[PDB]
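= Paired protein data =
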Amino acid sequence: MSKGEELFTGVVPILVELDGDVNGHKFSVSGEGEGDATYGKLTLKFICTTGKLPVPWPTLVTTLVQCFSRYPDHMKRHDFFKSAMPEGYVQERTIFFKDDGNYKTRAEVKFEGDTLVNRIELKGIDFKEDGNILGHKLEYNYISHNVYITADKQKNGIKANFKIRHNIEDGSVQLADHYQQNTPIGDGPVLLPDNHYLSTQSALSKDPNEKRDHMVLLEFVTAAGI
């Protein structure tokens, strides 16, 4: 029941802005949607504003607002994400694609008025030109995984590590090992959690009337483990 959680009681507009550079291939993505944390529900549409996306859309799902997670009543003292609002938090990750390159991301998630904004910078290096990522060999599928969270008292925040498996067009899998760290932007108290995890269901689709390179995403996220 942090003060920040009070800002998520209803439907909240979401805005996402990302600038990326993977092996020198630069691109930008904008996203808009709404989140209803009471139900851990998110509906968003992302657009590559610079032309064709140089990496597969599924590889950007985790990067492109865990503050919308539905925390059970008995676990609300463990919701770091909402507690950091409205000032927000910095979310950083290193994502290692097995036998390929890695993404390093830094984002600031905070409220700008009634809108929850996620601004991100993504840098990818060491990718293979004809690999599964730059070669666009990943299926446009359902990302269903867990995120294991632990407190990071030293940084007044949290850390998390988890695996994302992306189906490859040949039936195989491209592993993406995620390492995450979140720290509050403000100086007020936040909720440092006991170990737990977030279970997210992500469905990817296309807007039949959209000609720009894009991704429509429907997600449901719920905290558990305690």
Q: What stands out?
A: The first strand starts at residue 12 and ends at 22. The chain has one domain: 1-226. The longest helix spans residues 80-83.
